[PDB]
Ligand SMILES: C[C@@H](NS(=O)(=O)CCCOCn1ccc(=O)[nH]c1=O)c1cccc(OC2CCCC2)c1
Ligand SMILES: C[C@@H](NS(=O)(=O)CCCOCn1ccc(=O)[nH]c1=O)c1cccc(OC2CCCC2)c1
Ligand SMILES: C[C@@H](NS(=O)(=O)CCCOCn1ccc(=O)[nH]c1=O)c1cccc(OC2CCCC2)c1
């Protein structure tokens with residue numbers, strides 16, 4: 537039960553989790569972005585991750601950004617085997633622009649347990 | 663495998679799950695709210711919950727409210743150890759205002775199994 | 789560990805998963821739809837599914853559609869015991885209409901592990 541990660545640049549921040557039983561690790565922006573009202577942005581973390589076996593990585597919303605600034609997270613399904621730069625798709629549904637600065641926490645990364653079933657076609661179920 | 667909860671006021675409704683194999687328990691509004699088009703509201707349940715070990719509580723959308731009224735749920739990650747009042751962040755993307763009355767079902771609470779990995783930094787993955 | 793499915797019409801496409809460790813099976817539209825800017829549509833797959841025991845089926849967003857076209861997935865909680873036609877609720881938050889053609893991939897289906905706890909009311913937690 538290790539989540540490993542590597543920094544892809546000097547702008548990356550190591551993910552953090554304050555509480556031992558918090559659902560997610562904090563993801564941090566590696567760059568500044570300005571997100572206009574009713575617009576989206578793909579926000580780079582400049583980290584790559586190796587998820588534990590038996591899960592995928594869900595990029596999930598921060599609670600305060602959602603309730604206070606009408607920020608949501610799009611996309612969000614990081615496959616267990618993905619080794620690229622982790623991106624966060626932010627949706628700004630508010631009426632004001634939303635500013636992201638390098639080092640800001642912008643999402644959380646949850647290790648969601650899943651099955652990897654084989655698929656079988658039948659003519660009709662039970 | 664118990665989900666425990668306590669009512670924080672007399673306005674709270676005990677969560678329900680009709681089917682034994684439904685993914686979620688129904689969450690009910692403790693108050694009336696009017697949510698304008700393209701607006702958000704934090705809706706109180708006036709319950710506190712104690713989630714089973716090995717999960718977090720995902721506040722997830724009701725299917726009919728989403729398809730019929732363009733209601734979505736923001737935020738939604740309830741940490742395993744959270745003991746406060748459970749809030750539901752509703753996003754109204756429709757063109758008409760959305761009315762919540764006390765006692766209305768407004769979301770579902772899913773006990774999502776997750777890992778709680780330790781984090782380790784390396785220079786580069788494999 | 790089988791995911792079974794049946795086609796409800798000749799327009800359905802068998803779900804696919806390219807990578808062995810991809811989080812989701814691709815869901816395909818059985819029909820053409822035009823989704824106006826800032827509108828929603830319930831998109832039929834014309835498949836029925838039988839999920840493995842111990843999960844629900846999460847209809848989750850495709851990453852490219854989210855980042856490139858501002859498409860999101862609403863609703864999305866398919867109960868373990870659901871045997872109806874699988875619908876995908878697409879939200880088009882972009883400024884242009886979004887075209888779905890029969891056979892297009894429109895979402896992914898994730899077998900999310902969950903608990904099915906019994907619920908217990910107490911006066912106050914710990
Ligand atoms: C344009 C589009 N390309 S994409 O090929 O559709 C997905 C590429 C990234 O896959 C991993 N992933 C999946 C979901 C997620 O939320 N975050 C994330 O990092 C995309 C979508 C989402 C995130 C992206 O992040 C970019 C930042 C640097 C590399 C990718 C890109
Ligand atoms: C303003 C902001 N404060 S916040 O500190 O960011 C989060 C406080 C609540 O944390 C638990 N939680 C987390 C996610 C969720 O969806 N629901 C929920 O109850 C917030 C965000 C979401 C729900 C909230 O509910 C309030 C209702 C009464 C107490 C908190 C508050
Ligand atoms: C109108 C509304 N009816 S509903 O009764 O609220 C839900 C009916 C479908 O339940 C399974 N389900 C649940 C969530 C999901 O995302 N997809 C899905 O197939 C609804 C909501 C979502 C999907 C729907 O799909 C329709 C396509 C053909 C049958 C249902 C319908």
Ligand SMILES: [Zn+2]
Pocket residue numbers: 547
């Ligand atoms: Zn630089």
Ligand SMILES: [Zn+2]
Pocket residue numbers: 673
């Ligand atoms: Zn009162």
Ligand SMILES: [Zn+2]
Pocket residue numbers: 799
């Ligand atoms: Zn036909």
